[PDB]
Write a new protein. Structure first.
Lengths: 79, 103
């Protein structure tokens, strides 16, 4: 499984549940499987470089970290 | 005590005291106690041989595999226990937490 760079961002507000949540949990739903990323330097801007115009980069980056990390009780091969 | 009397002959031996042990859990309705005491009976009736019965240890094990009817549908989780001392360095925070939560 993979997402091609900013395949995540989307028109409406509340972008994250429209894609990144559904796919990233789908990788937990799948059997042992990678997620491939490219151009992370486009997907997760350094949050300190704050952005105007809805700051959506903060929304993506927060949801991505929350779904990714900690991984307690969750070592299901999601490389 | 009534349910341990009712459906089938049973005895907890004083290996545990009969009162207090209930407070091993709390979120239970009376309906929960019925099904829970059935789970106890069947589980130890399975893990022990088909002879006479006593609940010690196996109660404390099996209670791990249950949640009350009020909760079972709503999301809940339990972690791989990072016990107090495992994160225990700079205990100051953990102590603040335990103090303020345990009241």
């Amino acid at each position: 499984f993979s997402v091609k760079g900013p395949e995540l961002l989307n028109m409406y507000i509340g972008e994250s549940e429209a894609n990144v949540r559904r796919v990233f949990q789908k990788a937990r739903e799948a059997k042992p499987c990678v997620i491939f990323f490219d151009q992370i330097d486009s997907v997760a801007p350094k949050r300190g470089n704050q952005g105007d115009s809805g700051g959506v980069m903060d929304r993506i980056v927060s949801q991505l970290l929350a779904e990714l990390d900690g991984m307690s009780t969750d070592a299901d091969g999601v490389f | 005590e009534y349910f341990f009397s009712k459906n089938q002959i049973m005895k907890l031996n004083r290996d545990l005291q009969f009162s207090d042990l209930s407070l091993e859990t709390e979120g239970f309705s009376p309906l929960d106690l019925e099904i829970f005491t059935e789970k106890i009976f069947y589980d130890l009736q399975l893990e022990r041989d088909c002879d006479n019965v006593v609940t010690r240890e196996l109660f404390s094990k099996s209670l791990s595999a249950f949640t009350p009817s009020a909760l079972r549908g709503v999301k809940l989780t339990k972690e791989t226990n990072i016990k107090w001392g495992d994160i225990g360095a700079l205990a100051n925070a953990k102590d603040v937490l335990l103090e303020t939560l345990e009241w």
